[PDB]
Symmetry: C3
Subunit: 148 residues, 3 copies
């Protein structure tokens, strides 16, 4: 198998795929909140589900969208950075720690966001998860630059 | 060529690249709608194109933005999942079917969204396209876990 | 090192990683503007930082969000396209030029957007940066199709 290309790769692929699934869960939650609160973005959706007055914004829907957007602002870069980083021959335990901190940080972020936990709990989880991303980015920069 | 690294890779690269181009088309459509409806997000844009009153929201512009955002919520994960999945030695025909269902589902989604087709046509196309993504995610999880 | 897999790869990894860091800078700027202008998206954030009246929109915050979103609409596709393109054996100088035009175009885009430069400066930087992306997409299409 080509997953054995690098010692850190399986750990990366596990954490990244779990986080993609976690984003899919947010998407599903968003849809279920739209239906339960009857708050649709489109008139065609609203007319199917009770009438044109249900084409409206809702605070819980907007919150779900913000969590999903923040995921796109953070998890997508990790998908790129963590993949490249996996092939730079990092220490397996150190790599594991990078991936685990991001995984735990991001899962905690979604729980804090959707669960409406007091500030700055969500903010701290964002910063915590950004740390391994910043670390990997710098390491990729050094490897790329030295190979020019 | 390194496209011959795996039998499923060319099919993946064709479908993914077509979908990226499809996202670029949505971006172009969005810009053209902004100009035609004179609905700009920025005062500097508005002042160039008729005056400050044209810094305003528009339902068709917002619809275009929603289609583009939904693309980012779905196609970007596919770019990651489908790439990794291509290297897991899946059955070539089965892999083809995963990529084709996503491609057809997503193109149909954009047509349904921008064309304002009746509910739940758009919703169904989203769910249909998510199926192969869910499938690939699970398969990656198993391969990653078994290599830890 | 696996960065020596293709002659164009180090150039790609340098430009892409710089652009991811550039997106992180936009995220940080956004947060700092929220705090300085006291414009928070969440009631829990607002109550921590002065009261419920500070859960409000702000034009500068919205501008930052638009720049970040446009980055997601353009840089993320480049991360995929440029990576694949790096392995298609392109002319090293030609590949360099693709990556440099995108890097300069996108950095200029963020400066033009956040700096509120007159139209159509921002619009032109977007189009300029899309050119190498369009080029790479077509090249990937040809390579993928010919390997089917
Ligand atoms: C799980 C997910 C699809 C994300 C969701 O809950 N979306 C909310 C949602 C929003 C607007 C509409 Cl119109 C529907 C709808 O009716 N859908 C449908 N009807 C029959 C089959 N499918 C659903
Ligand atoms: C195709 C795409 C670029 C996505 C589009 O249609 N954007 C809408 C758009 C929005 C605001 C402005 Cl200010 C312009 C504009 O004037 N642009 C320009 N002028 C000269 C060269 N370029 C265009
Ligand atoms: C740099 C970045 C994190 C992106 C930023 O400036 N965010 C703005 C922001 C928005 C809402 C809140 Cl509630 C905070 C906050 O208090 N955060 C915090 N307190 C203690 C530790 N961390 C910050
Ligand atoms: C990956 C998906 C994680 C979903 C986490 C959802 C956390 C729900 O948490 C709930 O939030 C409610 C407010 O939204 C509160 O009223 C409840 O007390 C709380 O249990
Ligand atoms: C947003 C603020 C994050 C700052 C923390 C930076 C993360 C540290 O990252 C470290 O950088 C060093 C120098 O590049 C490298 O030698 C290490 O391998 C790397 O772990
Ligand atoms: C990848 C880009 C696909 C673009 C699909 C656009 C579909 C346009 O479809 C059009 O939508 C209009 C409302 O928006 C309707 O008035 C028209 O009847 C319909 O033909
Ligand atoms: C959103 C709901 C989607 C549920 C459909 C799941 C897609 C099925 O996916 C299947 O999963 C099996 C077990 O992991 C694997 O053995 C198969 O290879 C895979 O095709
Ligand atoms: C990657 C991050 C790039 C940040 C570029 C910020 C450019 C700031 O530019 C500033 O913009 C202000 C309006 O916003 C103007 O009042 C100032 O004249 C101008 O210097
Ligand atoms: C948005 C408008 C962009 C149009 C510019 C297209 C970029 C040109 O791209 C070129 O395409 C040729 C044919 O596919 C290839 O032979 C070249 O390698 C490629 O550089
Ligand atoms: N787009 C973000 C940029 C800054 C950011 O990612 N902040 C973190 C920590 S405060 C966050 O959880 N933001 C909430 C959000 O993105 O909706 C924002 O507007 O807040
Ligand atoms: N962000 C999505 C999450 C759920 C989703 O992706 N739903 C599908 C099927 S109903 C969709 O086409 N949503 C429309 C959209 O994202 O604008 C939303 O708010 O609806
Ligand atoms: N989502 C974009 C699609 C078109 C686009 O990317 N336009 C460029 C050049 S005018 C841009 O800088 N748009 C500003 C933005 O996305 O906020 C939009 O609404 O404008």
């Amino acid at each position: 198998s080509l997953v054995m290309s690098s010692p850190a790769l399986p750990a990366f692929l596990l954490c990244s795929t779990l986080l993609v699934i976690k984003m899919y869960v947010v998407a599903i939650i968003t849809g279920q909140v739209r239906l339960r609160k009857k708050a649709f973005a489109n008139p065609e959706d609203a007319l199917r589900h009770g009438g044109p007055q249900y084409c409206r914004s809702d605070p819980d829907v907007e919150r779900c969208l913000r969590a999903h957007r923040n995921d796109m602002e953070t998890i997508y870069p990790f998908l790129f950075l963590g993949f490249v980083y996996s092939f730079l021959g990092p220490n397996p335990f150190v790599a594991w720690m990078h991936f685990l901190v991001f995984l735990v940080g991001r899962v905690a972020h979604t729980v804090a966001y959707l669960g409406k936990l007091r500030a700055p709990i969500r903010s701290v989880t964002y910063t915590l998860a950004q740390l391994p991303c910043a670390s990997m980015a710098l390491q990729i920069l050094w490897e790329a630059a030295r190979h020019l």
